[PDB]
Write a protein that binds this ligand. Structure first.
Ligand code: CHL
Ligand SMILES: CCCCCCCCCCCCCCCCCC(=O)OC[C@H](CO[C@@H]1O[C@H](CO[C@H]2O[C@H](CO)[C@H](O)[C@H](O)[C@H]2O)[C@H](O)[C@H](O)[C@H]1O)OC(=O)CCCCCCCCCCCCCCCCC
Ligand code: CLA
Ligand code: CLA
Ligand code: CLA
Ligand code: CLA
Ligand code: CLA
Ligand SMILES: CCCCCCCCCCCCCCCCCC(=O)OC[C@H](CO[C@@H]1O[C@H](CO)[C@H](O)[C@H](O)[C@H]1O)OC(=O)CCCCCCCCCCCCCCCCC
Ligand SMILES: CC(/C=C/C=C(C)/C=C/[C@@]12O[C@]1(C)C[C@@H](O)CC2(C)C)=C\C=C\C=C(C)\C=C\C=C(C)\C=C\[C@@]12O[C@]1(C)C[C@@H](O)CC2(C)C
Ligand SMILES: CC1=C(/C=C/C(C)=C/C=C/C(C)=C\C=C\C=C(C)\C=C\C=C(C)\C=C\C2=C(C)CCCC2(C)C)C(C)(C)CCC1
Ligand SMILES: CC1=C(/C=C/C(C)=C/C=CC(/C)=C/C=C\C=C(C)/C=C/C=C(C)/C=C/C2=C(C)CCCC2(C)C)C(C)(C)CCC1
Lengths: 193, 154, 42, 97, 198
């Protein structure tokens, strides 16, 4: 239960992966919407579980924050630099057309297939090691995935809001500012400027 | 300052209005004797004019190019006394009036002739209800949560 | 007597007494605190 | 920088997407959408002599049904995207970071 | 005969007398609805308890300062002082902690007995008490929550709430603190009254 004392909604039984009973606005009132949301949540969860590592790992190295690592395209003659080496296709029109064709194709494959559990948990070629072998550990990993994903989503909100509270900063740079003085460099100073 | 305005304590037109107003009253004063009653009346109006202009300039009122106090109702905390604070005071009084009148209409709606107590006021009932508006934001808020403020299906 | 008090509770008489008391109060308020475009007590 | 290069690449990719990628979604959506109808019946059946769709021009020996109109639609996409790319490259516009 | 706030006036019907501190006092009829009465009972308890701690923390450090034992800032000047943390950080700590505690108490107000157990440690739960009077770890000395005892809690809370209402309004018009006001009054009460202060 996400809030002990509150009665659970009628349609949230507790069987679905991540079913802690959270729907105050009753957005999943319709099973069509609820099933579509169950797919869309995992998509956001998985994009965030790929984003957060890619957002904070280059910062630990010599590369700047994720906001400045997407800056060459602002100026005319931009040149991308993966690992400090100027890649030849660094121009914005090149990457823009490349990302459009590839991302649109792959993400549209998800639209053309409605099961609608293939839209959630496809597997097959996407499960070579076969962690879906046991329908109990596979559902346990479903719980592990949705909680890891919600954790990464909350972290992505933190990164973006911190980026707003400190324009042109890094998440780990904000962490170091908090480590310098946790009692004088807290959100209270941006909550109470 | 805000919106290009200058505070009335700094505006020259504001001080020129105070001068010309006082000098106009003094021009009316020379016609009468120093011990006269019109003289004490005009002198009191002059002192009342000085008090008014000084109070406006002291409480941070902003003046335009015309030397007249302009009010800023955007919510800027430097001028809450110009709208938000008197507005909250009004909403307290208005809610008081409406809540007391509503309590009266509810109390007489079950009378044999409810129209009788609407054209002939039941002053005892009124005097007992006039002080319920003192806590009107509370009694109203509770009636909002308990479904007592709005008639069901109308 | 009771009929006289019932007459004093009629709508116009109650309105006059109520509005007269209200008019006198606002007059004395603007007499001890004349002008005032703002709420100065902050 | 070359108009033929941008126009051929843009139109070629547009026709490629519309034939092999965005084809089944477009056809199933235009099937569930249907023909526009007045008073619960098509414009032609109601009595509009000029509202009969030209199935002869829609005839195509293509295995999937790509006809002239599909070429015209996705080709117009390619040329508009091409001239957008060309016009955005020649203006020399640059914001300020 | 449960105690009459006004010896002449009768007690309202909805105020039975089963509540501690009941004296038949509700002229405006704010607790006519039993649900409003149930909510306002908790509001009186929490407001009275905070007022009791507040009045103590405002008066007792100041009298000990004016006597000479300690030198503690006054209750209105204690905020401007410098502390080990930024006042903004102190605010966020207090907000988060109360945003957890007050909502846990609120779940008991709506649904009684629904938050008696620790969610971290499954054991170590609270025994069943009444709303506003949580047992278990909240009563370590194991006193008896009864009448008089609860009536004295409400009575001290009412006087402390009036005491807080006095402290804030006094400090506004008199400039100094509560104990300084009492000393100024004790020196010459007939010439150091609210009549003289205004
Ligand atoms: C919950 C009730 C509460 C009350 C009644 C007050 C009342 C007051 N605080 Mg205060 N505070 C309260 C809670 C809190 N304060 C602070 C942090 C501060 C600071 C940092 C300051 C005050 C100050 C003040 C005073 C502002 C001057 C004034 O009103 O002059 C009439 C005032 C007496 C100011 C002060 O000391 O003014 C002299 C000040 O600088 N408070 C925190 C921590 C976040 C609080 C948490 O609950
Ligand atoms: C100074 C710092 C500390 C302050 C602490 C706070 C103090 C506040 C004190 C308030 C009371 C002091 C004066 C009481 C004098 C006795 C008046 C009275 O007989 O007070 C009680 C009366 C009647 O009480 C209740 O009044 C109710 C209202 O309904 C009635 O309303 C009318 C009552 O006249 C009619 O009788 C009508 O028929 C009926 O509907 C019900 O009758 C209840 O049964 C009855 O118990 O109310 C009323 O006049 C209410 C009048 C008091 C309102 C106070 C508002 C303060 C702002
Ligand atoms: C877009 C991402 C997304 C989506 C699609 C879902 C979808 C779903 N969630 Mg989930 N959730 C998310 C993010 C998301 N969640 C995040 C980030 C968290 C961590 C806080 C959670 C934590 C969570 C819990 C604990 C539970 C769910 C549950 C559910 C399911 C039922 C709720 C529902 O039907 O509402 C549908 C949701 C939407 C339609 C998304 C609406 C988005 C709105 C418009 C904007 C959100 C405002 C946001 C607060 C802004 C903050 C930004 C910041 C700058 C302030 C459902 C399938 C419940 C469940 O039973 O799981 C099966 C459940 O118990 N979620
Ligand atoms: C879907 C998630 C995601 C996304 C959208 C990105 C996106 C990006 N990454 Mg990143 N990355 C990710 C996950 C992700 N990453 C993860 C999980 C890791 C940990 C292994 C990394 C580690 C990483 C490093 C070390 C670097 C980037 C860099 C970059 C930027 C340029 C990439 C490039 O040059 O071409 C594509 C590169 C390959 C195909 C290889 C780009 C904006 C580079 C950068 O900082 O930009 C300046 C950089 O050097 N990423
Ligand atoms: C910790 C997060 C997490 C968790 C617990 C799961 C859990 C699960 N996933 Mg999932 N997934 C995730 C993240 C996660 N995923 C991310 C970020 C993506 C990319 C968008 C995907 C994309 C994905 C797809 C397409 C599918 C699944 C499937 C599944 C289910 C069975 C497969 C499995 O168990 O894999 C095991 C997971 C692990 C062994 C995690 C260890 C891997 C390490 C820790 C990665 C760390 C390296 C670095 C940070 C990431 C770089 C890797 C990158 C190059 C891919 C299972 C419930 C399949 C399914 O639904 O079954 C039917 C399915 O088809 N996942
Ligand atoms: C909705 C239209 C409106 C509004 C908003 C105002 C507003 C105002 N008028 Mg005005 N007036 C209006 C219509 C309006 N008037 C009309 C139509 C006429 C022609 C009859 C007048 C004629 C008029 C005159 C002759 C005067 C004003 C004055 C004033 C100001 C005095 C405020 C005051 O009384 O001190 C404060 C009063 C209170 C705080 C009373 C509330 C307290 C209650 C009773 C008790 C509180 C219990 C807690 C004020 C800003 C006076 C002024 O000098 O302007 C600066 C003045 O002399 N008005
Ligand atoms: C809910 C009631 C309440 C509240 C809000 C406060 C609030 C405060 N007290 Mg106080 N106090 C209280 C009750 C309260 N007290 C009571 C009942 C007593 C016993 C009579 C005291 C005795 C007391 C002393 C002796 C001192 C304070 C001080 C302070 C201030 C510094 C905070 C602090 O002590 O550091 C954190 C508290 C921790 C427990 C850690 C602060 C504004 C100190 C001060 O004046 O600041 C310099 C100070 O020296 N208080
Ligand atoms: C479909 C139609 C819809 C239409 C919707 C229209 C919306 C139009 C806008 C609506 C909301 C407008 C809000 C504007 C706020 C302006 C104040 C501001 O942002 O500046 C920030 C203001 C600035 O405040 C000013 O500061 C100045 C010095 O810089 C001076 O001190 C001024 O005196 C002071 O007023 O600070 C605040 O007071 C904001 C505090 C907010 C705290 C919120 C905490 C709780 C949050 C939850
Ligand atoms: C909570 C409270 C006070 C809490 C104070 C605190 C925490 C103080 C904290 C600090 O000071 C310290 C300790 C140290 C300082 O350095 C810092 C600060 C921060 C300053 C007061 C409540 C105070 C609450 C009060 C005064 C409530 C009064 C309610 C009344 C009188 C209602 C009566 C009636 O409603 C009935 C019952 C029936 C109706 O029909 C008629 C009417 C008359 C309406
Ligand atoms: C802040 C501000 C502002 C803004 C505002 C806004 C924009 C808002 C709003 C608002 C709104 C939008 C509100 C609402 C409403 C709604 C509803 C829905 C209603 C209601 C009411 C009622 C219900 C009532 C009841 C009663 C009472 C209680 C009293 C007496 C009696 C009666 C019955 C009347 C401005 C800038 C201007 C100025 C400054 C300040
Ligand atoms: C034989 C064959 C083939 C081939 C084919 C081809 C090659 C074709 C085509 C085609 C094409 C290639 C088409 C196109 C295009 C189209 C269109 C239809 C167009 C257009 C244009 C436009 C529309 C324009 C507009 C404009 C203007 C006018 C000006 C301004 C600008 C703009 C741009 C806007 C293959 C082997 C493959 C297969 C089998 C068969």
């Amino acid at each position: 239960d996400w809030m002990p004392g509150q009665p659970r909604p009628s349609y949230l039984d507790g069987s679905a992966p991540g079913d802690f009973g959270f729907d105050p606005l009753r957005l999943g009132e319709v099973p069509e919407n609820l099933e579509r949301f169950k797919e869309s949540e995992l998509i956001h969860c998985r994009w965030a579980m790929l984003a957060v590592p890619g957002i904070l790992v280059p910062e630990a190295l010599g590369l700047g924050n994720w906001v400045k690592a997407q800056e060459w395209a602002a100026l005319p003659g931009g040149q991308a630099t993966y690992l400090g080496n100027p890649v030849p296709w660094g121009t914005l029109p090149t990457i823009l057309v490349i990302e459009f064709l590839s991302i649109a194709f792959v993400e549209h494959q998800r639209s053309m297939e409605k099961d609608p559990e293939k839209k959630k948990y496809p597997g097959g070629a996407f499960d070579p090691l076969g962690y879906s072998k046991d329908p109990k550990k596979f559902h346990e990993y479903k719980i592990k995935e949705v909680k890891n994903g919600r954790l990464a989503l909350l972290a992505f909100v933190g990164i973006c809001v911190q980026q707003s509270a400190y324009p042109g900063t890094g998440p780990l740079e904000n962490l170091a500012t908090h480590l310098a003085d946790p009692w004088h460099n807290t959100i209270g100073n941006v909550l109470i400027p | 300052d805000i919106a290009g305005l200058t505070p009335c304590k700094d505006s020259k037109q504001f001080a020129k209005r105070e001068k010309q107003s006082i000098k106009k009253l003094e021009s009316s004063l020379k016609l009468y004797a120093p011990d006269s009653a019109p003289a004490l009346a005009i002198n009191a109006t002059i002192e009342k004019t000085k008090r008014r202009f000084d109070n406006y300039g002291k409480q941070g009122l902003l003046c335009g190019a015309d030397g007249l106090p302009h009010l800023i109702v955007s919510g800027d905390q430097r001028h809450w006394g110009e709208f938000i604070t008197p507005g909250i005071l009004f909403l307290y009084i208005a809610g008081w009036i409406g809540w007391v009148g509503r309590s009266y209409l509810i109390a007489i709606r079950d009378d044999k002739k409810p129209t009788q107590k609407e054209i002939i006021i039941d002053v005892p009932l009124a005097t007992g209800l006039v002080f319920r508006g003192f806590s009107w934001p509370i009694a109203a808020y509770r009636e909002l949560l308990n479904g007592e403020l709005v008639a069901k299906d109308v | 007597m009771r009929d006289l008090k019932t007459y004093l509770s009629v709508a116009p008489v109650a309105s006059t007494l109520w509005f007269a008391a209200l008019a006198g109060l606002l007059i004395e308020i603007n007499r001890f605190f004349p002008d005032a475009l703002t709420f100065p007590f902050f | 920088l070359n108009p033929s290069l941008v126009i051929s690449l843009s139109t070629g990719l547009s026709l490629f997407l519309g034939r092999f990628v965005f084809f089944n979604f477009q056809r199933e959506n235009v099937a569930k959408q249907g023909l526009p109808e007045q008073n619960g019946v098509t414009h032609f059946e109601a009595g509009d002599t000029r509202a009969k769709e030209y199935v002869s021009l829609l005839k195509s020996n293509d295995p999937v049904g790509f006809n002239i109109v599909d070429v015209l639609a996705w080709g117009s996409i390619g040329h508009i995207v091409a001239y957008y790319i060309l016009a955005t490259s020649s203006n020399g516009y640059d914001p300020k970071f | 005969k449960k105690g009459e706030w006004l010896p002449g006036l009768a007690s309202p019907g909805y105020l039975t007398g089963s509540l501690p501190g009941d004296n038949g006092f509700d002229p405006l009829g704010l607790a006519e609805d039993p649900e409003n009465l149930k909510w306002f009972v908790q509001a009186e308890l929490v407001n009275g308890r905070w007022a009791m701690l507040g009045v103590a923390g405002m008066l007792l450090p100041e009298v000990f300062t004016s006597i000479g034992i300690i030198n503690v800032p006054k209750w209105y000047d204690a905020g401007k002082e410098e502390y080990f943390a930024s006042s903004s950080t102190l605010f966020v700590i207090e907000f988060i902690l109360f945003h957890y505690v007050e909502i846990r108490r609120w779940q008991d107000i709506k649904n009684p007995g629904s938050v008696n157990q620790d969610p971290i440690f499954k054991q170590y739960s609270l025994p069943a008490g009444e709303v506003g009077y949580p047992g278990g770890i909240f009563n370590p000395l194991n006193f008896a929550p009864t009448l008089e005892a609860k009536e004295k809690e409400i009575a001290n809370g009412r006087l402390a709430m009036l005491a807080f209402l006095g402290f804030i309004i006094q400090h506004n018009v008199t400039g100094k603190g509560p104990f300084d006001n009492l000393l100024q009054h004790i020196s010459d009460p007939w010439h150091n009254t609210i009549v003289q202060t205004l």
